[PDB]
Amino acid sequence: GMFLLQGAQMLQMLEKSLRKSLPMSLKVYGTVMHMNHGNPFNLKALVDKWPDFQTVVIRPQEQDMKDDLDHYTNTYHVYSEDLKNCQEFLDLPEVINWKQHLQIQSTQSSLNEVIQNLAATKSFKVKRSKNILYMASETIKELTPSLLDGKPKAIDPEMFKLSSVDPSHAAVVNRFWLFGGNERSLRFIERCIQSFPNFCLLGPEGTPVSWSLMDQTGEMRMAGTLPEYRAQGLVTHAIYQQAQCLLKRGFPVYSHVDPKNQIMQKMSQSLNHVPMPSDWNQWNCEPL
């Protein structure tokens, strides 16, 4: 079937039900926690059955998804306890509109089978990004304790000053983001700057030299450093502060790393972030 969740009590019941599917449900779980704290991206949660759902999809509002090319807006967060149910649920046009350029995100790699099946029946092509999921040790201990000083090196506070990311910083974030470099990615970065608590280190003339952001899933993302300032652990500082902020507010701290990126794996380990067994996935889908 198809049921729309509404209000704090249902979103809390969904969070509780997803705790035993961590870390595979983490991409959804983080999104739902941020939906329950002001729903800044104006998302909605769909399940196939309630309360005993098998598949959950977080989607945006139809009337916000006007640009068929804007896969940053057209993002769906999925977790399923049964791949056949999942395929039947993602087959419903009120759940996912496959006629747009879209992204599916999940910490559950097994969904690949479902998405490759629908690629044939809904006539889309798919490109998959698969990365290493990292979680803070504090978040593992709170959420998945059965799976279980991390402070950055001191830097000169006269040279580098911790601030928030300003909207005027969006273009530099966009320039360095692996998934950015265009106007659609710039607008998405600007929505993350408006919506969430992000950190940067300012150098000469309040130019950002290193930055840490997060998106509507709660994941820490879009972090970067100007090339001239790399190898001074500036990015460790912005990420450390962003994580401390989220931990103090009771949110999960998690991120992902390209398995080829040795520097960012070592940076994450220096903060006591742990690689998890369930990969981070994004499927970019567009009509043939």
Place of tokens 């000469």: 204
Q: What angle, rounded to 10 degrees, do the helices at 262-270 and 234-249 form?
A: 50
Place of tokens 């449900």: 25
3-class SS of residue 167: helix
If we measure between CA atoms, which residue out of 83, 85, 74 comes closest to residue 108? 83
Resolution in A: 1.6
The whole-angstrom separation of Cα 209 and Cα 234 is 8
Place of tokens 């499927």: 283
Place of tokens 């790393």: 257
Q: What is the largest CA-CA distance in the chain?
A: 59
User: Do residues 104 and 112 lie in contact, with contact meaning Cβ atoms separated by under 8 Å?
Assistant: no
At a CB cut-off of 8 Å and minimum separation 6, what does 273 contact?
A: 134, 135, 136, 137, 243, 253, 255
The whole-angstrom separation of Cα 9 and Cα 28 is 17
- CATH number of the domain that residue 161 is part of: 3.40.630.30
User: Do residues 127 and 115 lie in contact, with contact meaning Cβ atoms separated by under 8 Å?
Assistant: no
Tell me which method was used to determine the 3D structure: X-ray
If we measure between CA atoms, which residue out of 144, 24, 132, 33 comes closest to residue 86? 24
Angle (CA) 165-171-172 rounded to 5° is 70
What would you report as the CA-atom Rg of the chain, rounded to the nearest whole angstrom? 19
User: Do residues 196 and 213 lie in contact, with contact meaning Cβ atoms separated by under 8 Å?
Assistant: yes
DSSP state letter for 152: P
Cα separations in angstroms, 141 against 30, 144, 147: 16, 6, 8
| Domain around 187 | 142-275
Direct distance between the N- and C-terminal alpha carbons of the chain, in angstroms, rounded to an integer:
28
Strand partners, 132: 257
